[PDB]
Every structure is written in C-alpha cells, then in structure tokens.
Design a protein around this nucleic acid. Structure first.
Lengths: 98, 141, 296, 78, 138, 65, 224
RNA sequence: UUUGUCUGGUUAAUUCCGAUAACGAACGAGACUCUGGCAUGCUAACUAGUUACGCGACCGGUCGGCGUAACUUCUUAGAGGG
C-alpha cells in the first residue's frame, strides 16, 4: 500500500506525468487505483496598486493555484523505486509514504 | 403507526417533553436557575420560570437527532445575535454553564450517557423516553 | 400512387435515419438530432399513426444512424460523440460501450449472421468491431482521405462512400482496397445495397445515384435525378430503388428507368427513407420535426 | 561526414581527454579545433567528427546539458 | 429506481425514488413537517397538481443540503417532480411522461427546469456588485 | 450588439471563395467543415465563422453578392 | 512539519532572491535568468548566460565561488549544489540580455540615439517581428521627458502579451541622475516551437490551400 | 499637408454596411485567459459519497449508528462537447 502524491501549480505537466506513471504501472500490471483529485487551494492576496495612496483607489488581485493529486498502489515497496525515475519533470514534486 | 421524533411537529413535542421533565420530579434543579442570564447577548431572564425543564427537553431532543456532541457544540447550537449599541451586531456564543449543568442533570436521572468519542449520546432508555413522548403527542389531535 | 398518411411527434430535433423490423410490423426506430433513439409503437390509428413507446438517451451529441439485430430488442447506433452503444429495448440499458474512434460516427451497419459490426466515421478511418468491445482487426488500414459518410453490408464485402468522391469496394475481413469506382462530381452522402445484395446505387452532392453491380464491379446504368441526396433506399419487393432529394422523394422504376411520381407535401428537407420489410410503407423524416409516413 | 559544433570548453581540458565525453556514441576519427592568435591557447569552439547522422543526434542529446568544467554543455547542428 | 436532483442555488436537493406503497420523506421528515408554512404549497405542488394517484407506486426520500431555506424549498419541489418524471420515463410508457410534462411545465417551469441565476461578485469601490461609495466633491 | 467584426466576415468569405463544393445551408455541417479547411484558434471564432458562412449561404444562392 | 502553501511560497521567495542576487552580481556575464532542477542526489542550478567566459572567472573560480555562496547563504548542505552555465541561442530575443547591453553601452557612454538605433537594428535583424525602446529621464538638458524608439509591430493587450511579448526594465546610474531603459520585444511565430511560441495568435485565421483536382467526367472503375 | 478615417443606415465600439480617388492593411475595440451556467456520456477514487446488504438500538418506519460489496446520481476535477 504505497501512495505517490503529486503537487503542482499547473495542470498540464501534472496531467502528463500522471498519465506517464499510470502507463508505466499499467504496462507492468500492478494494482493501481486511479488519480484522486483533491481540491485546489487558491492563495489570494489583494493589494492596493498605488505606492503613495493618491489616486482613485484601484485595487489589485493576485492568485496562485495549487493542484493536488495522488495515485495509490499495492506492491512490494522496493519495486516502487523504478516508477519515480521517469517523473523528474519540473513543476511536479513527488512525496512517497507507506 | 410507529411514531419517532423525526415524523412529528416540533413545536408541541419539546413542550410535552418539558411537561414530563417537570412532572417526574427526578430532574434536579440547581440553586441559581432563577437569577441568571443565558448568554452575554440576551437582555433578560426568561418570562416563564420553567426555562430549565424546556431547555433540558430541547437538549435531549438535540441529542436524539445528532449525538457525538459536547458542551462546546451545544454552545454552537445555542448562540444568537448580539445587539452591540451603536456598533454593528455580532454573533456571540451560548453559555457553557447552563449546558454543563443541564447535561449532568440529564445524566442524573439515567437518561443520558457520554459518547465513545468523549462527547454525548443517548442511552436506549433515553431513546425510549423520547419515542414514548412522540407517541403521546401523536394522538392529541 | 403513393399517398402520404400523416405525422408522428415525440421530437424536438431533426430526423436522420429510420430503422424498421421484419419480425415486428408495428415498431420503428427513429434516430434524430434530439440526441435520443425512440422505440415507436405503431398503433396504425386514425388520429396519431404511431405513438412514442420508449426513448433511449445515451449520447451527448447528434445521433446519425440506428440499425436493428436479427431478433430486435438489440440495436446498434452511432452518433457525433464518436461512439457506438448496444441497446436492449426491453430493458432500455446500454449493455456495452465501443470507444476507440477519435471523431464522429456518420453511419453504421448490422449483419444478418452473428458477430459482425462495421462503422464509418469522420476521422478518415474505417473500423470493424467484435461484440466484445475490442476491435476485430489491427487498424492501420489505409482508409479514405476524407470523411466516411456511409458504410454498408451485403447479405463478403465492405462497401463505403466518402467525401473524396470514390465510393469503394473492399473485401470483408482482409480490409483491402479491392475495387475503386470513380464517377462522381461532388461528395457522396448515401449509398445502399439492395435486399438481395447485388446492386449499389450511389448518390451524393450531385443528386445522382450511379447504379453499380456489387458482385462484379461494373457501371451498369446512369440515373440523373434532382437535388442533393440525403438517402438511397430500396423497395423490398418492387425493384424501384428510390431516393430522397432535398424538397422531395424521387422514385425510379428500373424497367424503363422511369419516375413513378414525385412525393409532395426554403421548404423542409426530407432526410430519411426506409421501407418496412413487407413493402408498401414509406417513411420520411423532416427537419421541422415531423415524421411522415407514405402508403400506397 | 556528420558535422555538428561543440562549445564551452576549458583551457586545462585537452583534446585527447575531450574525446571521452562523446566516445559513448562514437570515437572521433579527427580533432579539428580553433585556437587563439595572441596566446595560441584554446579558442574553445570547434567541429567534432562523427560518422553517421544517427550518431550525430544521439551523441548530441546526452552531451547537451552535460557537466563540463561546471557548465551546461552546448551543441547545435552545423 | 432513480435518484435525480434539482437545484435552484447552492441549495441542492436529490430525491431517492424507488418502488413502493407511497411515501414522501424530506431527510426523514415527511412533506407536512417542513418548517416554513407560508410556503407549504410549494412542496405540495406535485401532490396537488398530479394527484396522489400519480405517486401511487413510489417511495420518494429527499435529502437536501446547502443554501438557504427558500432555495431549499425550491430545490425540494423540483427534485420531487424530476423524481417522478425520471421514474415515469424509465418504468412507465412515454405518453404518460408526455402528459405529466405538459401538466407540470405549463403551470410553472421551475418544477422541471433549473434556475441559472447565481450571486454576482462584489468588485471594489463599493459595497456590492453595482453600488458605489458616496463620492463627495467639495 | 451582435455585429460580426472584420475577421469573422472576411475570413468567412475567403473560406467561401475556395471550398464551395463542401459548404451548405446547415450550420452544424459547416461547423464541422471548418477544421479540415482551416487552422483556427479556439472555437468561439470557429462558431462565429460557421454562423457567417451559414448566413452567407442563406444569402448567396438567390443572386449576386 | 510545514504546510504545502508555505513550502510553495518559501520556494518562490528562493527563486526571487536567487534571480535578484544573480542580477546584482552578474552584469558582465550576459545574465538573463536562472533554472532550478531538484533531484535528491544533487540539487542543480542552471544559469542562463550568453558569454560563459566571464561566468567562470579565472579557470572556473567564480562558478565554484557561486556554488560556495549559495551553499553558505541559504543554509544548503555540504555537497548538494553544483552550478552550470547554459548557452542562450539568441541574445536579440531576450529582453534582459539586450537591456543589459543597452545599459552597458549607455553607461560606458555613447549618444543615446545611436545606442537605441543600434539596439533596434540588431533586434529587427535577429528575426523578431517588432521592438519598442523607451529611454527616459534627463536626456537633453535638465528637464526630463520620454523618447520612444519603435520598429515593426507590437501587440499590446489581451492574453497574448503574456507569451508573445518579452519585456525588461533596467536602471542605469549616470552622474546627474538615473535614466530608465525599457525593451519590449515581440517574438516570431516559429510553429514547431524552435525559437518561438507553439500556439498561434488567436485572431490569426490560417486557411489551408485547396488541392488541385481535375474532375473525372466519366464513370470508370479500377481494381486492386 | 490632405483623401484613405465620410453625407447616411447600423453597432456596446473608426462595429460594420453603403456611398466613394481610393485599394489593401497594423495598433486600440473584438478575438484571447480566468470565472459563472449544462451533462444519468467518458475518467473516476477509505482524506469523497450514494445505495443493495449484515447486525445493533427504538414503537414496517427512524437512526451523521457500526462495519462491509456494487456503482459514480449527489462531492471533487480534468479531456472533449455545447
């Protein structure tokens, strides 16, 4: 019961590496339960635009999304080293616990 | 038919359970039930001096519907709106003294036990004592 | 000598195809642009000829074709999502799901015997399917350079049509390009195979069904009809090989190659042509959401 | 032949030792190299020889972003 | 057996409708036991409109969450009507579905068709979406 | 206001000059036609191009434009 | 331990301070940006520069010095950081490198106009579609004003200014004040993605040409 | 330096039609990104739920009451459709 946990700020690299990891685990046919899409946390900081406070008080709205996914599989726990060597694309980082 | 709390009108049932919690005489009444305010937002003491039995009645009905609750969730149920004078109004929590003393006084007549998770729940005997009162409001129309 | 017998409404969308039954005289399948497949029960009644019995909704987008099984409760359909589903009409269920196209199915076909599914689609492919929901053959198969508007069977060929104007003749279960018939100016919309299995009338943009022989591969006739063809379909017993033009249905009579008559009713367009297999029933589907019935 | 250019070399790195960076795909049959005119030291851009164009790409890919004298090595088709 | 929702707002109601001897229960209380009673006819509107004979084979259990009280009522009646029409299309013949849909749609279209209106966001410079602050000149 | 801008009624006309043998009077056929015959970025331009070639084929077959 | 959000924020602050410090040291090197790639054998930091021979120093002294100072300042462990130099293909399509080049020409001193026209001529000779350079400040006399140098076309609004437009703002310190140098470059299309963006502009309707087919004008078959 | 960019009709818009010594265009508008509204069609899942069960508690019904096997309607969120 080893669960690999993926996190990024963009959806497309995370979707490519999750598709590649389930393709590498469906080619060897371990039991893989599919990607479980955890809800996105928006970090929003709403600051004022003007550096001295003189104008017509227009406000500025920043945000950043965190996309949080996982794959869970039942296997021997040293077979699991060979799948996480194809997943080294930037953005997405991998946290593994048992 | 079979009559539980969830199938009947909830304006008369709490007052009939308050009539049973008056008429048995086995609910203890502590010494300060007649001089207290019931949170920091209310203005006055109750109109009717039978507020303790009515409050214990509704409290056991709330333990009928959702158990796994404690005093700190009983104050989340029993909060209200604070008028603050010239400031805006606020939501301010209910009193833990009344909920602690009502729930221990309902444990005193073997009607109420604690939960496995530390908060509260009903007994089978306290389940029986409320479904019979639902069965007795069920005929009064 | 063909007379229009009325109207049928369950519909909110444009009719594409009508599929009817030899074992069941009172039962139609009507697929349409209301994204459903309707089991109709023909009561053959005075005010409303047949009424809606069961409407099957499994598709996200426009259904283009329905075909029925040997013993119908089972039907195979295709739609503009690109997939095919298997429907038992008594339960109404989607028994199996046939993914593996990339783009929209334009026309499908059933066989008489066991275990043959062909279907043609917009993504320049032709596929043969097993009933397993797994493909019968490995598909690289050097298909049409345009959309495949129709594919048909003969009761051992695959016969197709296209938007690159060469119709085809293929072999069943080797998927080869065996005979290649180039006569058309304009894209090909609808062909048909006659209920013996020898003839191909091949019609299209130009409104011209070119009459082929399917057993030998030779152009036998030329029939210069009307406006743009939506359908070619047979009589079962009468050897007419009639066609459905835009404002009208054209009948031919191949003894003289004479028109019997025209079938009269921007006009709404006739999009469907099917005879129930006893004869003397002529079904026509329209874009103002009537379904029309023609008897002798 | 197969021609492609390599860059970002070093002064203490010599041509006989630079052959072992790309020898995993093919061993270069020559070494042609620019050197400077004032010092006669390494001008550090050159044209290395591989034999076939299949060797020209597969040498190039691993050598790209490979660590040479704490740098990310450079290749382009020429 | 169907379960088919109806929503007005962030209030969401879904009725669980399977075969039986007649039932309506919204989260375990029946339809005559919901708190707002100036709006009592809104939940009863399929019962008054379709009649109790049209419900005569089903056991409908409604589970609600979210929203306010009135949006919850307007999701209850829509989920009940969609429950009976989804049961009628799957298990009864479709002319009965045609009769029930013209008797339900022509009265009120929120019984079968949802509400696409949601609350539009506040923007700056004023206390609501459109309203703006008082803007003294002198 | 629903007025079509320069690209959705110049690009629709340069789509109509060639490729007239594929176009027709129904919108849903021409909407599916427009991705084989062009390279258009995303679909709202493509639905607007398809709406103008359907309106232009509604206009054009009864006289000169 | 620490949150996911505070981890993402603190790594973003690491990118910000690393790019700001590397700009403040490396003016001469052609510094345009940095690239982090982290694997737990060794955490890899890749610098973008057009001239590597000033990145190294004396036989690679400053790149091992840079490894040492990033190891010391951010609390990095002994032997998990090594430092590379990636060669950028086009100096004329990176606004940071050309902004430094105009800054170095004007700081080493030139006429302002012949500096800006050399920059605009090199950018339009490198293969971009367009450019705009504003050098503003105490240009002529003691009253400051705007001087704009454009050539070609520029896109200004919408979402495609985020992937078709490269910009940079830099400061140059002269004896009587500061002057402000902006370089905005539009990139060319380059449909494979070789030196330019993959998706086209969203208003740019490209029509494939029709195939030249002659009609058959007879019904005719062919076997095999 | 001017016409192109206008008498007029139309548009939320120099947005378009039309007139026409102008013809074709570029920036701005529009397109585009994000959000809202739809899906019994796909992908689906003990940090999410439905329901058929098995048992406990209460006079067939109630249980956010305790744990199991099929599904993706309700939750999450992608790929396309619209």
């Amino acid at each position: 019961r080893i669960r690999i946990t993926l996190t990024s700020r963009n959806v497309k690299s995370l979707e490519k590496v999750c598709a590649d990891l389930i393709r590498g685990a469906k080619e060897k046919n371990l039991k893989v339960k599919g990607p479980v899409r955890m809800p996105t946390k928006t970090l929003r900081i709403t600051t004022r635009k003007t550096p001295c406070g003189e104008g017509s008080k227009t406000w500025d709205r920043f945000q950043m999304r965190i996309h949080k996914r996982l794959i869970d599989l039942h296997s021997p726990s040293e077979i699991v080293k060979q799948i996480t060597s194809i997943s080294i694309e930037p953005g997405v980082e991998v946290e593994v616990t048992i | 038919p079979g009559v539980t709390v969830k199938d009947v009108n909830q304006q008369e049932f709490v007052r009939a359970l308050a009539a049973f919690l008056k008429k048995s005489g086995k609910l203890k009444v502590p010494e300060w039930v007649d001089t207290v305010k019931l949170a920091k937002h209310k203005e006055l003491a109750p109109y009717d001096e039978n507020w303790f039995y009515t409050r214990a009645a509704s409290t056991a009905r709330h333990l009928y519907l959702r158990g796994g609750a404690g005093v700190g969730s009983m104050t989340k149920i029993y909060g209200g709106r604070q008028r603050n004078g010239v400031m805006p109004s606020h939501f301010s929590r209910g009193s833990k003294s009344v909920a602690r003393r009502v729930l221990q006084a309902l444990e005193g007549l073997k009607m109420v036990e604690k939960d496995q998770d530390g908060g509260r729940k009903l007994t089978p005997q306290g389940q029986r004592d409320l479904d019979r009162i639902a069965g007795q409001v069920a005929a009064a129309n | 000598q063909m007379t229009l017998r009325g109207t049928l409404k369950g519909h909110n969308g444009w009719v594409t195809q009508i599929a009817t039954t030899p074992q069941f005289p009172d039962m139609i399948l009507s697929a349409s642009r209301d994204k459903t497949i309707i089991m109709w029960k023909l009561t053959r009644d005075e005010t409303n000829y047949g009424i809606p019995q069961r409407a099957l909704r499994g598709h996200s987008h426009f259904v283009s074709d329905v075909v029925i099984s040997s013993d119908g409760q089972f039907a195979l359909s295709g739609s503009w999502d690109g997939t095919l589903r298997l429907w038992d009409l008594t339960t109404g269920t989607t028994t199996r799901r046939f993914v593996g196209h990339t783009k929209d199915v334009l026309s499908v076909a059933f066989s008489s015997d066991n275990r043959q599914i062909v279907s043609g689609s917009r993504d320049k492919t032709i596929k043969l399917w097993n009933t397993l929901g797994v493909c019968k053959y490995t598909v690289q198969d050097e298909s049409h350079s345009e959309w495949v508007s129709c594919v048909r069977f003969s009761p051992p060929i695959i016969v197709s049509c296209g938007w690159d104007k060469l119709v085809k003749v293929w072999n069943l279960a080797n998927c080869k390009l065996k005979t290649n018939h180039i006569g058309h100016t304009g894209y090909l919309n609808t062909v048909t195979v006659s209920p013996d299995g020898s003839l191909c009338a091949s019609g299209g943009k130009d409104g011209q069904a070119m009459l082929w022989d399917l057993n030998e591969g030779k152009h036998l006739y030329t029939l210069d009809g009307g406006d743009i063809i939506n359908a070619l379909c047979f009589s079962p017993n009468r050897y007419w090989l009639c066609a459905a033009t835009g404002p009208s249905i054209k009948i031919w009579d191949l003894e003289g190659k004479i028109i019997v008559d025209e079938l009269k009713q921007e006009p709404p367009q006739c999009t469907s042509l099917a005879w129930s297999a006893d004869g003397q029933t002529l079904f026509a589907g329209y874009t103002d959401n009537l379904v029309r019935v023609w008897q002798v | 032949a197969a021609a492609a250019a390599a860059a970002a070399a070093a002064a203490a790195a010599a041509a006989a030792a630079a052959a072992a960076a790309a020898a995993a795909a093919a061993a270069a049959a020559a070494a042609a190299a620019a050197a400077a005119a004032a010092a006669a030291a390494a001008a550090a851009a050159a044209a290395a020889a591989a034999a076939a164009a299949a060797a020209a790409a597969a040498a190039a890919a691993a050598a790209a972003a490979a660590a040479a004298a704490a740098a990310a090595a450079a290749a382009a088709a020429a | 057996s169907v379960q088919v929702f109806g929503r007005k707002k962030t209030a969401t109601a879904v009725a669980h409708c399977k075969r039986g001897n007649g039932l309506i229960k919204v989260n375990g209380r029946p339809l005559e036991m919901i708190e707002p009673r100036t709006l009592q006819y809104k939940l009863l509107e399929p019962v008054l409109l379709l009649g109790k004979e049209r419900f005569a084979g089903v056991d409908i259990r409604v589970r609600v969450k979210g929203g306010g009280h009135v949006a919850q009522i307007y999701a209850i009646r829509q989920s009940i009507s969609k429950a009976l029409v989804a049961y009628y299309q799957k298990y009864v013949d479709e002319a009965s579905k045609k009769e029930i849909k013209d008797i339900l749609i022509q009265y009120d279209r929120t019984l079968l068709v949802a509400d696409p209106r949601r609350c539009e966001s506040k923007k700056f410079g004023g206390p609501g979406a459109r309203a703006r602050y008082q803007k003294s000149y002198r | 206001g629903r007025v079509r801008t320069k690209t959705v009624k110049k690009a629709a006309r340069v789509i109509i000059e060639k490729y007239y043998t594929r176009l027709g009077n129904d919108f849903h056929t021409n909407k599916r036609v427009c991705e084989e015959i062009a390279i258009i970025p995303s679909k709202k331009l493509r639905n607007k191009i398809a709406g103008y070639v359907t309106h232009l084929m509604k206009r054009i077959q009864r006289g000169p434009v | 331990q620490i949150s996911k959000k505070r981890k993402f924020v603190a790594d973003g602050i690491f990118k910000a301070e690393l790019n700001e410090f590397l700009t403040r040291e490396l003016a001469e090197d052609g510094y345009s940006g940095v690239e982090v790639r982290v694997t737990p054998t060794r955490t890899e930091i890749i610098i973008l520069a057009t001239r590597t021979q000033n990145v190294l120093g004396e036989k690679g002294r400053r790149i091992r010095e840079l490894t040492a100072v990033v190891q010391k300042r951010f609390g990095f462990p002994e032997g998990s950081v090594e430092l590379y130099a990636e060669k950028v293909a086009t100096r004329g399509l990176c606004a940071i490198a050309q902004a430094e080049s105009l800054r170095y020409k004007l700081l080493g001193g030139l006429a302002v106009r012949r500096a800006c026209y050399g920059v605009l001529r090199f950018i339009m000779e490198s293969g971009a579609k367009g450019c705009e350079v504003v050098v503003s400040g105490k240009l002529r006399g003691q009253r400051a004003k705007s001087m704009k140098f454009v050539d070609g076309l520029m896109i200004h609004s919408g979402d495609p200014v985020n992937y078709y437009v490269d910009t940079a703002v830099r400061h140059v310190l002269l004896r009587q004040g500061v002057l402000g140098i902006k370089v905005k470059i539009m990139l060319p299309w380059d449909p494979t993605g070789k030196i330019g963006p993959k998706k086209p502009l969203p208003d740019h309707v490209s029509i494939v040409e029709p195939k030249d087919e002659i009609l058959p004008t007879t019904p005719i078959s062919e076997q095999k």
